[PDB]
Design a protein around this ligand. Structure first.
Ligand SMILES: Nc1ncnc2c1ncn2[C@@H]1O[C@H](COP(=O)(O)OP(=O)(O)OP(=O)(O)O)[C@@H](O)[C@H]1O
Ligand SMILES: Nc1ncnc2c1ncn2[C@@H]1O[C@H](COP(=O)(O)OP(=O)(O)O)[C@@H](O)[C@H]1O
Ligand SMILES: [Mg+2]
Ligand SMILES: [Mg+2]
Lengths: 489, 463, 48, 463, 129, 129
């Protein structure tokens, strides 16, 4: 029978199925148990299939049947504030999810004619990545570095800062210890960010199929809001562990090996997933919604994370993924130990979208940061002997030092647009030439605190509007003058 | 007469036919009931063909019928493909309608003969000052483009597209290998805005496609360029056409991944056993034949900053010139930002280009070299040092740097100022005069975006 | 002052030459390591 | 039913069963006429299961019968295992007669769910200077020691055992330490004379056993730790049993030794294809649920003394506090040889340890990192050349590098000097004084194996 | 007391034998169970107790403790100790003595590296003085 | 007089055929038989005696000595003569002409480095003048 199949091998988590003629690629299968399976390779005389679940209960001779349905996941607005597996089942023990409709996990990105330029911006609360390396709605950027260098902290702060912006967030964790996932969810719930945050978990003690098919499901949940005209944001805690799981699965299928044992198609694996984060045009939204939504666009933002060994960025997977994204954020181990907390390397970090993804005030005020940091990079080595240098170069060096110290911040404390603008304006105008280098952070924190209690209405206008006007500039200048006149750090 | 699929593992698909009729290498087949067409890559026994699909294979069961086209993937090529976006097989993706062309050509064609093409070095005049002075091209040459985003690479490409048609009545073809979708959309919209889309054709190969698509797209662009070359005008004279390749590094990587997929044994350091043969198949066909010419501008990525790596080594054996775009000059505000000290050519010799041009270029080059060696001192301790000679060298270097810039005809719309297609002789004469010292009185601000030589004078007398 | 500048420029030249040699060695070692690993992997996959 | 042996290569033995009586995975089997038992590893169809023999395969031939127990290897768990030493199948090897316990649990079991995961909130002093400052511990956590052969992992493990386990009451500790027999026999003896053998259970395997025994030692110890913590005395707890394994690496070494014989293709460096999941399924079960707590300490071997090996690199993600030992510091005379850099603990947060502790730790790490980059400059140019703000950093870095050294109670046979113990507050006070610039006149030779600051003052006075 | 002239040659011979016999190759072109090969041999050196002597001798001799000492030798290439095999053997024994070429050619004989050479037994295997 | 425009490309073509013939890769960049491929070719260029000429020609020619000279060309990457193929041909030839690139870009053309370019039969071939 076409539906009827057998089992001829159960080893290391992969099952070879006899019979099952006229099957399909990616079509789920039943397995005579709660667990279901997937049909990755269709050889001449035996279908291969991985198992999504615990395979220890599968034995030779057990039966399996082809459903005829491609893997799908529950998707909707009722998944906010819940924690699920890579298939969509709750694990937090807060009751069943009232599912409304499902969607496929493997789809294709919208065509070229159905896209639009990225002008809408996305804030992260970090003065390091919001003035030098801006991110926009629809852009895809990478966070890359070594172990224990604050890669996740930066990802999580972005989710925390999406309060008061209406952007739904999704969090995917692959190959992590369960206690770390639990602590992350607890910290998310503590701040109140769990309301708009969905979590998909696949821990270390979980078959490689669920550590391999998790980012696809996360993206599918993230695509619901884009097609409806709303914004979304998705974060993959690690793509390296997913690559390792894919390598393990392929090597168990004995597919042709390659450099570092990787199979033939590793570039396609991450390319097809990372090409689905895009901004759609209003016409596409109208066509998809059949006119229920008009004059609205959508946007999906992606922030993959990749871990490198000993600083080697020339390995196979890091080079595959660097060429795909529209930017790169580089975190250095030496900078972390040196005291630079957000630990970004501004020299090599790049963003292809550029200033097109900023508000007017941020875009106006951003240039004085890059100029100062470039000059300090060029003149850094002259620190020992500086009296011989002329006064202009010494002043440039001092400004570079002060700016480099201002770039520091604290986790779980995202900055707002108004605070960033005030700090950058105070830096550019030169009001911090008086202060000592060591006490930059204290001065910055005190100045921000004074404004939010004294000039909160101005801050509200800046936050909602974001437009920069002569009057706003005059108000900011007067407020900073008042603070410097009457306050003690 | 009809086959059926017998194996499906990822992209690779083995298809079995009758023993008598077996499609040749590189032939194309179509699977009934679906949008997938198959391509033959390696022939095995028992009448079993090992092929690579040109699309996504999700939802593909075994035992489906396949019909043989018996010919390679033929693309519709003609005058109706001007200003359209087409994929690897030629189907429009701009949602604008089918292409009216009926005539079609294969993409796998034998290379020209030994005496089929006869050429003498003959410079192609683009009209750009710095390129025609320091890195002259040649009809039938291949040019390597170095640099990333943020330096207006697309602006230079658009300017070349416009100038070739303005001067030599030449159409152009654009082929993208593994291009990002966002960048392709921006490029299409900006070329539509700048009124250049009417003279160019487009073929896109996207990242999210399987490697079998991003591999065989350069041939698809090349077929169209070759057809444009051989369209006889009244009184012959053929035509001069161009070809842009987005990145040949991704072309080699597509080859490497395909070879890995079919199971060929690795060569040397993780590269396909067959790499050079393929790049000769591509690069050789870009030649100057008797009835016309095809040039080519290609962007090159150097992996791991290693020129010793086999891929750049195989690449550099076919190049005739290298254009290096610098982020420093772009930050300076002079566009184009083409580096005047790191760009080289194989035509900058006293024989082909003429002696006077040769020593003019050499003189400007070592002047710029002296300025580069001295700018560190001039920037660390200022210009307060007292030495007349190097000060004069500094002023001449600054004047030359400003003079290298010129306004383009692509920005007239957003800028409001007109372009200038400066002829080579005026550039040579102006540079000779500048080196001699006659224009030691003109203010340096009078050379910014000032087109030819005389214009500079009036602009100066305007002040 | 002149002698100090002479020593410094000699040091710069030596450092540049050393950098060139180290880069050559590094590229050679990287390619050799990749090739050796590929050979070992292919041999192991053939043995099984 | 009963099967027969059809093939034997070293440790790997595959036994062919009947059509319908094929034993499930991990269904231990008994070989009749011999003390050997087999465990199922993978199925191969046709009624053949490829297994691994627990015990030597010398003395057996093809054709021998086997009886299926249809149950995993079960060990005796209870209060009667306290004070007893047993081999992996649970057979006592202390010549003390059988064990009176009927409760038995399988060694293969699933992992705790996400719902029943408990946080860790209380610190745990250990007396070491570097550990209590740069890497605080916490009850219910996971701790690992990373080192290359000959660098002192054991000595540190024995010091930790002697420093916390002997003092905490009702611990019901568990010992899974596996090492050179000489080191083991001494332990059992040392534990006895101290009269602490009452509340300790031990499972021990040597290095000479075939891969069957070395593969499943840790699972037995985990089962004995799981039973203890889970149980609850009336109005009582599980006793917070503590687990100490000195044999984590052998698990993976035996896995990779037998992977090739099970048919698995080579991966990465050549480590087995399924390294990550095999390490995870074991490293997960060592956790503290809401029904109890487990405090574990492990020893992690670093092959070839590089931390980018796939075996130690995978284990970093599974631990809370990580301690890394360096060969160079050991060769320099400093003991314990822990790399101040590259050692971190999750419990190092301003909200957990406090405010002063965090600043002290960060300042120390900053000073050392700054000193790590001044070596090349000192080489090329004289020491005199560097400014005084870096002379201070160099001298303070040297003093700090020696002040993190202290003599141990356990390791007195080597050096012959009496052992020492330091509380946390003394460590904080001394380091605060040092980073402040006080103790800048004391020579760096008085900070060696001197322990507390007042001892530093006295030792400096003696010189 | 027993001395092995060079165990590296034994390792090479074992790799030969296990390769001519069809067994899958492994890291460094060496085969599986090399650690087991070098460990099942060295662990046979031990100091038995008087009870073991009495039981083995069937009461012929009493109040005596047996012993056996080993001194295997391993050679290295280019003077490195971080090679995979040298470390695999270091992890088995109770110490090591390292001889350096740079010290040998400098006139320091016997060339023994104090920092990298250790003894695990310590002062227990010594006279009182 | 025979001139081979490039011999490294011949090595690359031979490597391609060998790798497509499913032969093992080996630990070196090229297979091990590239050495013999070049040696079997460069060995065939030599001077014969007058007696051999008469013997082969059946006495038609007398008192005349044959000859054959080879001038193969080898391509290097960044002046690396330590690679596999370049060092195989240096050691089986009677001389080397080292053309630099620094001199070529400096105007000195032809760019011949006399320090390292040597000949073995030199001083016998040259005429008296
Ligand atoms: N901005 C910051 N300021 C201070 N400490 C920070 C900051 N960012 C991170 N940390 C510290 O870094 C550690 C956490 O590192 P993190 O988990 O981000 O790194 P990771 O190993 O890359 O992550 P993961 O493995 O979970 O992806 C903690 O000690 C935390 O206090
Ligand atoms: N605190 C210490 N004091 C003196 N010597 C030590 C100390 N710790 C370790 N050592 C030396 O380092 C060696 C490490 O031995 P051990 O720790 O048993 O091996 P491993 O490091 O492989 O576990 C010992 O032989 C001992 O001589
Ligand atoms: Mg981490
Ligand atoms: Mg050890």
């Amino acid at each position: 029978a076409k539906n009827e199949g057998t089992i001829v091998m159960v080893s290391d988590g992969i099952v070879r199925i006899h019979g099952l003629a006229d099957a399909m690629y990616g079509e789920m299968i039943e397995f005579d148990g709660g667990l279901f399976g997937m049909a990755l390779n269709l050889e001449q005389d035996s279908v291969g299939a991985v198992v999504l679940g615990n395979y220890l209960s599968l034995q030779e001779g057990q039966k399996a049947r082809c459903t005829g349905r491609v893997l799908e996941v529950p998707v909707g607005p009722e998944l906010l504030g819940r924690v699920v597996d890579a298939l969509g089942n709750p694990i937090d023990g807060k009751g069943p999810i009232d599912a409304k409709l499902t969607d496929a996990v493997e789809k294709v990105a919208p065509g070229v004619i159905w896209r639009q330029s990225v002008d809408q911006p996305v804030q992260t609360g970090y003065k390091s990545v919001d003035t030098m390396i801006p991110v926009g709605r629809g852009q895809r950027e990478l966070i890359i570095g070594d172990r224990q260098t604050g890669k996740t902290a930066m990802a999580i702060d972005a989710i925390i800062a999406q309060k008061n912006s209406g952007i739904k967030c999704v969090y995917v964790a692959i190959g992590q210890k369960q206690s770390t996932i639990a602590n992350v969810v607890r910290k998310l719930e503590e701040t109140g960010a769990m309301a708009y945050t969905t979590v998909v978990a696949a821990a270390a003690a979980d078959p490689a199929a669920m550590q391999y098919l998790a980012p696809y499901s996360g993206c599918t949940m993230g695509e619901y809001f884009r097609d409806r005209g709303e914004d979304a944001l998705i974060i993959y805690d690690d793509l390296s562990k997913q690559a390792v799981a894919y390598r393990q699965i392929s090597l168990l299928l004995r597919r042709p090996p390659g450099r570092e044992a990787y199979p033939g198609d590793v570039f396609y694996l991450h390319s097809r997933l990372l090409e689905r984060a895009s901004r759609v045009s209003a016409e596409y939204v109208e066509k998809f919604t059949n006119g229920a939504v008009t004059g609205k666009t959508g946007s999906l933002t992606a922030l993959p994370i990749i871990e490198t060994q000993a600083g080697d960025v020339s390995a196979f997977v890091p080079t595959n993924v660097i060429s795909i994204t529209d930017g790169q954020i580089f975190l250095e181990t030496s900078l972390f130990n040196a005291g630079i907390r957000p630990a970004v390397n501004a020299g090599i970090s790049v963003s292809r979208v550029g200033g097109s993804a900023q508000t007017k005030i941020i875009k106006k005020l951003s240039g004085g940061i890059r100029t100062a940091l470039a000059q300090y990079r060029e003149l850094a080595a002259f620190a020992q002997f500086a009296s011989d240098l002329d006064e202009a170069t010494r002043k440039q060096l001092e400004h570079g030092q002060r700016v480099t110290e201002l770039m520091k911040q604290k986790q779980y404390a995202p900055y707002s647009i108004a605070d960033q603008a005030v700090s950058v304006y105070a830096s550019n105008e030169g009001y911090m030439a008086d202060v000592e280098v060591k006490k930059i952070v204290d001065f910055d924190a005190a100045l921000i605190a004074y404004f939010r209690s004294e000039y909160a209405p101005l801050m509200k206008q800046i936050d909602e509007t974001g437009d920069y006007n002569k009057d706003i500039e005059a108000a900011i200048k007067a407020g900073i003058e008042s603070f410097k006149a009457t306050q003690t750090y | 007469s009809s086959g059926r699929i017998i194996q499906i593992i990822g992209a690779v698909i083995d298809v079995e036919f009758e023993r008598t009729s077996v499609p040749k290498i590189y032939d194309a087949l179509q699977v009934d009931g679906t949008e997938t067409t198959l391509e033959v890559q390696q022939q095995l026994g028992d009448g079993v063909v090992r092929t690579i699909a040109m699309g996504s294979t999700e939802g593909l069961k075994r035992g489906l019928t396949v019909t043989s086209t018996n010919a390679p993937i033929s693309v519709p090529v003609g005058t109706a493909t001007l200003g359209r976006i087409m994929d690897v097989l030629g189907r429009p993706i701009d949602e604008a309608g089918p292409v009216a062309t009926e005539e079609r050509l294969p993409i796998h064609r034998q290379a020209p003969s030994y005496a089929e093409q006869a050429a003498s070095t003959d410079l192609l005049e683009t009209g750009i000052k710095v390129i025609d002075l320091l890195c002259p091209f040649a009809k039938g040459g291949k040019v390597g483009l170095f640099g990333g985003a943020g330096v207006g690479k697309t602006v230079n490409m658009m300017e070349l597209i416009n100038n070739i048609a303005k001067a030599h009545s030449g159409l152009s073809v654009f082929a993208g290998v593994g291009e990002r979708t966002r960048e392709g959309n921006d490029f299409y919209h900006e070329m539509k805005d700048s009124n250049v889309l009417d003279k160019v054709a487009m073929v896109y190969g996207q990242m999210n496609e399987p490697p079998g698509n991003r591999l065989r797209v350069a041939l698809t662009g090349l077929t169209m360029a070759e057809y444009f070359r051989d369209e006889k005008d009244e009184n012959g004279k053929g035509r001069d056409v161009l070809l842009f390749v987005d990145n040949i590094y991704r072309y080699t990587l597509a080859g490497t991944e395909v070879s890995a997929l079919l199971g060929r044994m690795p060569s040397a350091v993780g590269y396909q056993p067959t790499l050079a043969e393929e790049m000769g198949v591509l690069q050789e066909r870009i030649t100057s034949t008797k009835s016309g010419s095809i040039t080519s501008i290609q962007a090159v990525y150097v992996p791991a900053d290693d020129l010793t790596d086999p891929s750049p080594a195989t690449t550099f054996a076919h190049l005739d010139a290298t254009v290096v775009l610098s982020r420093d000059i772009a930050s300076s505000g002079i566009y184009p930002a083409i580096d005047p000290l790191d760009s080289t050519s194989r035509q900058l010799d006293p024989l082909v280009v003429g002696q006077e041009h040769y020593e003019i270029a050499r003189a400007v080059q070592n002047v710029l070299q002296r300025y580069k060696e001295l700018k560190d001192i001039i920037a660390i301790l200022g210009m307060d040092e007292l030495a007349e000679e190097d000060k004069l060298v500094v002023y001449r270097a600054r004047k030359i740097q400003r003079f290298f810039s010129q306004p383009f005809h692509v920005a007239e719309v957003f800028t409001g100022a007109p372009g200038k297609l400066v002829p080579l002789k005026e550039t040579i004469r102006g540079f000779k005069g500048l080196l001699a010292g006659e224009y030691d009185h003109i203010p340096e601000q009078a050379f910014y975006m000032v087109g030819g030589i005389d214009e500079v004078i009036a602009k100066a007398e305007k002040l | 002052q002149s002698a100090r500048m002479v020593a410094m420029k000699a040091a710069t030249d030596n450092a540049g030459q050393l950098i060139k040699d180290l880069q050559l060695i590094y590229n050679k070692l990287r390619q050799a390591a990749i090739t050796q690993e590929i050979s070992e992997i292919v041999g192991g996959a053939a043995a099984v």
